[PDB]
């Protein structure tokens, strides 16, 4: 359960766990993977097979409102469940500053992963910082990170009848802009 | 950037008896180069430190592996070839060489993995020894002629 | 059976009977509904450099520090692609910002809209056609499931043990279904008015009369044949949801996009089994048998070449994203022009004379249902360019002059309906002698 | 004058034209598997038969950086050309005439457009007709007077 | 292009095409000979330009 460099006649530094009922022909120690990798090493004097897993697995993301506004952040751990974060990122071997982003009260579970550092808000707003799966975050009011759910638009209803029509009685003239790029810079390169 | 290993785990087999080095390096006599002999080595614990205060090697060259890494390695098919030549012919015991030794007496393969060890043994071997001077063709790697007249 | 070789056939052979006084005018029509599948977005991928190259190796990680501009460059190149996929969906589906409520009654003057609108009884919030479309196209695996199953080594776990991952889209399928439902309800209850301002209601028979008037057919034809037109539309909405159950090749483009999103990450995983001129493709074998001054030389040969594989993957992803963006732009233009209005461009919204279109949500794409007008039964007639009565030529205002054999009438071009030639139907320009092919008749 | 984000696309084009030449400059300080990234340090301490195999390791890799820059430049020009084609079509159809295509020239019913020059781009001012104040009425599809429908 | 082919004597078709651009169809019937001569001349002097 720790990041360890192992030496079963070969050097590699990973996390070692207990393997399941793996098939071994009583002749091999590691075997071979599809990407020419050696996985699930065998203890050389016993028959017990172990597990080789990278102890830095998956990607993490950091949500910030800008350094000139604040210095607090939120961490999104993709494709893991909440209350499995400290096992996934090996929180016992990290600094105490890193340990406060592995648990607590501001824990929210989305379809993009567990998000820690923002308390959930039941209101709906427009998207400020997109996170994924319909979840956006912002910096709202003393301020904090809100991590709400996005709103598609205003709700309306049309009164339909089989003898009814709406006809405008006035109008207005509107002028709007549209910006389109045309050309870019002309660069030249001398090889020598 | 947040995680780093801190301690080391090493697991090795149960072999415990030392490997016979004086039986090979300090044998009573050595064969001729045209009649070289091969010996298998198995169930050993190979530590080269025990020869430090008794031997002196003029040549120690390894191929496919680096020296000072043999301490922490496990081998499977260990074999030893012993013969006796002149002092100036040690340079011909190498993959891809030429000369009277490299093609008519003893030839190494191109994908050779192992080490070559040599040392001078004057005042120990006094008898007459033989070698192949010419042949109709060249020897294949790890092959022996073993014939006369 | 055997393999045969032949010359391909271009099409059916046909010939048109041309005469200088002859015209063909249709006497009947039909309503046809056709599909069109356009891709919108692809999968968003992210790559970790050190995890792919030398994950869990401090020696190569220290060696992978002269480089790093390349890795941040390719990371920002891949990040630019992933931001465009959400913009494509936003530009295609989020055209309007008024979530119009689904009407309680799905019948509008005999036209049945039940199959393209959500029903409150079913638990899912999408239409029957969308439910059929979502099953024609075939990841989010977690740690613990990957470790718990090594007896079956799937490709997704091998990708995630390197630095390759796939990010979820911003908009879920429920939001896309809500957007399509709002668009369908708006185009069913207000027609075309909500695309250029506030929605104005219309009883959908007068809207269909206006749409018939837009293609050159007078609006009394629809009011005369409303029951037959509604029956044809309901029959054409049917026998296309049963074509999505038996036939399994209509969604080929989206399946091709999905299959090309895969098998490029798989080749990136399998490209790690290459020496690139080194003694081994495994870093542990190099590090366990060579001293660091010699091991650095062999590690650099793997680094230069794993970087090459990553660069090749990024370049191909950019090239694919360009054509995905082009398809998304075409889909957005089609949604703005075929759904929010009536188009006069030939073969832009289906084949025939365009009436209206409906969008349906598909995985990584959109499906349009184009409703068109097709003339069916033509007949031979004798025509004249002009009629002169008292030395003055008369020309039709809208339509052509036809003769059934004895008398002369004037009818519209796309539907046979003869009327009496009066002075309201014609206008006077010149004399009889300046027109080639003029005939003698009387104007009431 | 107050809002400073309406011209973000041209500024993005300018910022992407930059910072790709800057990364090409900063990539010169890379060893590419050699003893040094400076050619003078290699040439001042090694004989030519040795130093050739170290100069080659820099040449292969500086060529790689140049090839990568050329490829990204071609890919960016591929979409700049499409944007320019759309701008030319909009100039031909929204300025020199009146278009019936929905939402092609602004939102609403198009009246006319005016072009304005911008750095590395063009700005269109679309004039449109927007109906504002609707009212309920009772309608009928047709009226018949003496047994004949109107 | 939108169904089965329906024949037309190509003078009424040209009159319809003239009506499509905002010109009344009597202009075509008044100047048919001049328009046909102009079309034949424009079909000429473009093959010799090739
Ligand atoms: C349509 O709206 C315009 C304003 O947009 C109305 O014009 C105003 O008319 C009032 C008197 O009714 C004047 O006091 C205002 O000065 C006018 N405003 C402007 C900007 O000219 C117009 O009357 C409305 N039309 C209808 C039919 O209601
Ligand atoms: C080289 O070193 C070895 C290891 O210490 C010596 O071998 C030991 O010698 C002592 C006497 O000095 C004996 O009592 C031990 O039994 C020997 N041990 C073994 C394991 O053989 C050896 O004598 C040294 N050789 C020389 C020439 O000094
Ligand atoms: C192995 O033995 C064969 C004979 O069994 C050798 O072939 C001879 O090669 C010489 C080369 O000059 C010829 O003159 C002989 O005629 C060959 N003999 C026969 C029977 O063909 C062969 O050279 C030997 N050595 C090797 C390395 O293959
Ligand atoms: C209109 O009349 C033309 C002839 O004036 C018809 O064309 C003929 O069709 C028959 C079908 O059996 C063929 O055998 C003839 O060869 C055709 N004639 C020519 C000159 O091509 C045409 O079918 C008629 N159209 C309709 C709709 O009845
Ligand atoms: C166009 O053709 C259709 C299909 O043949 C006609 O509809 C048929 O009308 C008859 C009476 O005339 C009914 O008995 C049939 O049941 C109808 N068929 C269907 C499938 O509904 C239609 O009348 C024709 N239209 C015109 C204007 O002539
Ligand atoms: C629109 O079509 C649907 C689908 O055919 C009709 O719904 C069916 O109606 C029949 C007759 O009442 C029922 O037996 C089925 O169970 C219904 N199916 C579903 C899926 O709801 C619907 O009635 C039609 N709408 C009309 C005629 O207004
Ligand atoms: C036209 O009439 C409809 C139906 O009465 C109006 O819609 C109502 O609007 C009021 C506004 O307070 C709502 O409280 C009702 O619930 C609506 N009724 C329905 C059935 O939706 C509509 O506002 C009228 N339009 C105009 C322009 O006056
Ligand atoms: C994560 O939690 C869900 C329920 O929210 C469960 O179905 C799933 O198996 C869990 N995944 C694990 C433990 O890897
Ligand atoms: C917020 O929504 C959740 C989920 O429906 C609900 O349990 C909770 O009571 C809500 N809180 C408030 C303050 O409305
Ligand atoms: C031999 O292997 C066994 C395996 O159970 C182990 O317990 C024991 O310690 C080993 N003996 C030595 C001397 O290493
Ligand atoms: C090795 O051989 C020599 C003679 O060559 C002999 O004197 C000596 O005792 C042997 N043993 C050792 C340990 O040197
Ligand atoms: C043509 O139509 C008129 C008016 O209905 C009718 O009297 C006449 O018999 C028709 N002629 C033919 C040949 O059908
Ligand atoms: C049509 O062609 C016939 C010969 O086929 C000719 O007699 C007649 O004058 C032509 N009519 C017109 C209007 O060109
Ligand atoms: C039409 O009527 C005029 C005037 O009576 C006559 O000169 C001419 O020949 C007639 N044309 C035909 C085709 O009958």
mmCIF file with all atom_site columns, N, CA and C in Angstrom, chain B residues 12-33:
data_model
loop_
_atom_site.group_PDB
_atom_site.id
_atom_site.type_symbol
_atom_site.label_atom_id
_atom_site.label_alt_id
_atom_site.label_comp_id
_atom_site.label_asym_id
_atom_site.label_entity_id
_atom_site.label_seq_id
_atom_site.pdbx_PDB_ins_code
_atom_site.Cartn_x
_atom_site.Cartn_y
_atom_site.Cartn_z
_atom_site.occupancy
_atom_site.B_iso_or_equiv
_atom_site.pdbx_formal_charge
_atom_site.auth_seq_id
_atom_site.auth_comp_id
_atom_site.auth_asym_id
_atom_site.auth_atom_id
_atom_site.pdbx_PDB_model_num
ATOM 1  N N  . UNK B 1 12 ? 14.660 -11.900 -3.065  1.00 0.00 ? 12 UNK B N  1
ATOM 2  C CA . UNK B 1 12 ? 15.597 -12.761 -3.769  1.00 0.00 ? 12 UNK B CA 1
ATOM 3  C C  . UNK B 1 12 ? 15.381 -14.221 -3.380  1.00 0.00 ? 12 UNK B C  1
ATOM 4  N N  . UNK B 1 13 ? 15.793 -15.183 -4.239  1.00 0.00 ? 13 UNK B N  1
ATOM 5  C CA . UNK B 1 13 ? 15.569 -16.604 -3.919  1.00 0.00 ? 13 UNK B CA 1
ATOM 6  C C  . UNK B 1 13 ? 16.399 -17.140 -2.759  1.00 0.00 ? 13 UNK B C  1
ATOM 7  N N  . UNK B 1 14 ? 16.267 -18.442 -2.501  1.00 0.00 ? 14 UNK B N  1
ATOM 8  C CA . UNK B 1 14 ? 16.781 -19.083 -1.297  1.00 0.00 ? 14 UNK B CA 1
ATOM 9  C C  . UNK B 1 14 ? 18.153 -19.722 -1.478  1.00 0.00 ? 14 UNK B C  1
ATOM 10 N N  . UNK B 1 15 ? 18.854 -19.436 -2.577  1.00 0.00 ? 15 UNK B N  1
ATOM 11 C CA . UNK B 1 15 ? 20.158 -20.048 -2.809  1.00 0.00 ? 15 UNK B CA 1
ATOM 12 C C  . UNK B 1 15 ? 21.166 -19.494 -1.807  1.00 0.00 ? 15 UNK B C  1
ATOM 13 N N  . UNK B 1 16 ? 22.003 -20.376 -1.253  1.00 0.00 ? 16 UNK B N  1
ATOM 14 C CA . UNK B 1 16 ? 22.852 -19.995 -0.128  1.00 0.00 ? 16 UNK B CA 1
ATOM 15 C C  . UNK B 1 16 ? 24.312 -20.426 -0.223  1.00 0.00 ? 16 UNK B C  1
ATOM 16 N N  . UNK B 1 17 ? 24.655 -21.460 -0.986  1.00 0.00 ? 17 UNK B N  1
ATOM 17 C CA . UNK B 1 17 ? 26.040 -21.910 -1.035  1.00 0.00 ? 17 UNK B CA 1
ATOM 18 C C  . UNK B 1 17 ? 26.830 -21.106 -2.057  1.00 0.00 ? 17 UNK B C  1
ATOM 19 N N  . UNK B 1 18 ? 28.106 -20.880 -1.754  1.00 0.00 ? 18 UNK B N  1
ATOM 20 C CA . UNK B 1 18 ? 28.960 -20.068 -2.605  1.00 0.00 ? 18 UNK B CA 1
ATOM 21 C C  . UNK B 1 18 ? 29.275 -20.793 -3.909  1.00 0.00 ? 18 UNK B C  1
ATOM 22 N N  . UNK B 1 19 ? 29.710 -20.020 -4.895  1.00 0.00 ? 19 UNK B N  1
ATOM 23 C CA . UNK B 1 19 ? 29.973 -20.614 -6.195  1.00 0.00 ? 19 UNK B CA 1
ATOM 24 C C  . UNK B 1 19 ? 31.433 -21.039 -6.295  1.00 0.00 ? 19 UNK B C  1
ATOM 25 N N  . UNK B 1 20 ? 31.725 -22.192 -6.910  1.00 0.00 ? 20 UNK B N  1
ATOM 26 C CA . UNK B 1 20 ? 33.125 -22.625 -7.019  1.00 0.00 ? 20 UNK B CA 1
ATOM 27 C C  . UNK B 1 20 ? 33.931 -21.773 -7.984  1.00 0.00 ? 20 UNK B C  1
ATOM 28 N N  . UNK B 1 21 ? 34.795 -20.924 -7.432  1.00 0.00 ? 21 UNK B N  1
ATOM 29 C CA . UNK B 1 21 ? 35.681 -20.077 -8.218  1.00 0.00 ? 21 UNK B CA 1
ATOM 30 C C  . UNK B 1 21 ? 37.096 -20.625 -8.297  1.00 0.00 ? 21 UNK B C  1
ATOM 31 N N  . UNK B 1 22 ? 37.600 -21.209 -7.209  1.00 0.00 ? 22 UNK B N  1
ATOM 32 C CA . UNK B 1 22 ? 38.938 -21.784 -7.218  1.00 0.00 ? 22 UNK B CA 1
ATOM 33 C C  . UNK B 1 22 ? 39.006 -23.079 -8.015  1.00 0.00 ? 22 UNK B C  1
ATOM 34 N N  . UNK B 1 23 ? 37.869 -23.740 -8.239  1.00 0.00 ? 23 UNK B N  1
ATOM 35 C CA . UNK B 1 23 ? 37.868 -24.946 -9.060  1.00 0.00 ? 23 UNK B CA 1
ATOM 36 C C  . UNK B 1 23 ? 38.034 -24.606 -10.535 1.00 0.00 ? 23 UNK B C  1
ATOM 37 N N  . UNK B 1 24 ? 37.629 -23.407 -10.935 1.00 0.00 ? 24 UNK B N  1
ATOM 38 C CA . UNK B 1 24 ? 37.733 -22.987 -12.328 1.00 0.00 ? 24 UNK B CA 1
ATOM 39 C C  . UNK B 1 24 ? 38.937 -22.081 -12.548 1.00 0.00 ? 24 UNK B C  1
ATOM 40 N N  . UNK B 1 25 ? 39.074 -21.037 -11.727 1.00 0.00 ? 25 UNK B N  1
ATOM 41 C CA . UNK B 1 25 ? 40.150 -20.071 -11.928 1.00 0.00 ? 25 UNK B CA 1
ATOM 42 C C  . UNK B 1 25 ? 41.502 -20.645 -11.526 1.00 0.00 ? 25 UNK B C  1
ATOM 43 N N  . UNK B 1 26 ? 41.528 -21.519 -10.522 1.00 0.00 ? 26 UNK B N  1
ATOM 44 C CA . UNK B 1 26 ? 42.765 -22.093 -10.002 1.00 0.00 ? 26 UNK B CA 1
ATOM 45 C C  . UNK B 1 26 ? 42.824 -23.601 -10.223 1.00 0.00 ? 26 UNK B C  1
ATOM 46 N N  . UNK B 1 27 ? 42.459 -24.050 -11.421 1.00 0.00 ? 27 UNK B N  1
ATOM 47 C CA . UNK B 1 27 ? 42.537 -25.463 -11.750 1.00 0.00 ? 27 UNK B CA 1
ATOM 48 C C  . UNK B 1 27 ? 43.994 -25.892 -11.913 1.00 0.00 ? 27 UNK B C  1
ATOM 49 N N  . UNK B 1 28 ? 44.205 -27.211 -11.903 1.00 0.00 ? 28 UNK B N  1
ATOM 50 C CA . UNK B 1 28 ? 45.558 -27.748 -12.001 1.00 0.00 ? 28 UNK B CA 1
ATOM 51 C C  . UNK B 1 28 ? 46.159 -27.509 -13.381 1.00 0.00 ? 28 UNK B C  1
ATOM 52 N N  . UNK B 1 29 ? 45.357 -27.646 -14.435 1.00 0.00 ? 29 UNK B N  1
ATOM 53 C CA . UNK B 1 29 ? 45.847 -27.444 -15.789 1.00 0.00 ? 29 UNK B CA 1
ATOM 54 C C  . UNK B 1 29 ? 44.707 -26.958 -16.672 1.00 0.00 ? 29 UNK B C  1
ATOM 55 N N  . UNK B 1 30 ? 45.081 -26.363 -17.803 1.00 0.00 ? 30 UNK B N  1
ATOM 56 C CA . UNK B 1 30 ? 44.145 -25.826 -18.775 1.00 0.00 ? 30 UNK B CA 1
ATOM 57 C C  . UNK B 1 30 ? 44.362 -26.486 -20.131 1.00 0.00 ? 30 UNK B C  1
ATOM 58 N N  . UNK B 1 31 ? 43.305 -26.674 -20.915 1.00 0.00 ? 31 UNK B N  1
ATOM 59 C CA . UNK B 1 31 ? 43.454 -27.324 -22.220 1.00 0.00 ? 31 UNK B CA 1
ATOM 60 C C  . UNK B 1 31 ? 44.006 -26.364 -23.267 1.00 0.00 ? 31 UNK B C  1
ATOM 61 N N  . UNK B 1 32 ? 44.359 -26.937 -24.415 1.00 0.00 ? 32 UNK B N  1
ATOM 62 C CA . UNK B 1 32 ? 44.772 -26.141 -25.558 1.00 0.00 ? 32 UNK B CA 1
ATOM 63 C C  . UNK B 1 32 ? 43.574 -25.398 -26.144 1.00 0.00 ? 32 UNK B C  1
ATOM 64 N N  . UNK B 1 33 ? 43.869 -24.370 -26.942 1.00 0.00 ? 33 UNK B N  1
ATOM 65 C CA . UNK B 1 33 ? 42.805 -23.525 -27.480 1.00 0.00 ? 33 UNK B CA 1
ATOM 66 C C  . UNK B 1 33 ? 41.979 -24.273 -28.526 1.00 0.00 ? 33 UNK B C  1
#
